[PDB]
Structures are given as structure tokens and as C-alpha cells.
Design a protein around this nucleic acid. Structure first.
Length: 85
DNA sequence: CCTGCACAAACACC
DNA sequence: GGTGTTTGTGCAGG
């Protein structure tokens, strides 16, 4: 059995993990589909200085993630797509 | 050099 | 389980 390595969480995913739970406790009956929309609206209102602390952490998680798997490569699966010429 | 696709995590609903 | 939603990252094509 092989365990697959998941991609490092980006500043928004890390910031949503803790913010998403905050909104769920205050809005435990709101569906993630709507919360995901308000978080994106609120996330776009944060300043770069306020977002910086979350970007640096994602950057640290990415470097630390790279230390665990220094040979890891992002290899997305392509779907059957052929554009006309 | 520029543009677009595929994929990361968490949760209510059917 | 799959559905339905956010933002940000890295690779491939022309």
C-alpha cells in the first residue's frame, strides 16, 4: 500500500482551516458552500501586511514539506482535451 | 514570455 | 460517497 503525498497548503487553505472552523462554530448551520463564499469575500479584504503572516507560514510549510520529500514533484492529471486548429 | 488546467483542505446535504 | 464552494501553487503548450 502506497501513501500519496498531498500538496503543501497555501496561505488561504491554512488561513481557512482555522478561519473555517471559527465561522462554523459561529455559523454551525451554514453550509460550507456559503461559508466558502463569505471567507473568500473576507479574505479579499485583508491587507498584505495582515496576509503576510499567513503567506510566510505557507512558505514555511512548503519548505518544511520539501524537507520531508525533497524529490516530490507536482504532477497533475490531464483530462482528454483536444482544441480545434 | 504568457495563458490555462489540475489539485491542496473542510463540511452540510442527498 | 459524491455534490458544491473558497483562494493560491506549479507545470505544460505555443
Amino acid at each position: 500500500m502506497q501513501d500519496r503525498v498531498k500538496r503543501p497548503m497555501n496561505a488561504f487553505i491554512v488561513w481557512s482551516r482555522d478561519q473555517r472552523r471559527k465561522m462554523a462554530l459561529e455559523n454551525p448551520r451554514m453550509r460550507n458552500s456559503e461559508i466558502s463564499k463569505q471567507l473568500g469575500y473576507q479574505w479579499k479584504m485583508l491587507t498584505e501586511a495582515e496576509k503576510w503572516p499567513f503567506f510566510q507560514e505557507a512558505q514555511k510549510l512548503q519548505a518544511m514539506h520539501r524537507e520531508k520529500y525533497p524529490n516530490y514533484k507536482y504532477r497533475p492529471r490531464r483530462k482528454a482535451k483536444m482544441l480545434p486548429k
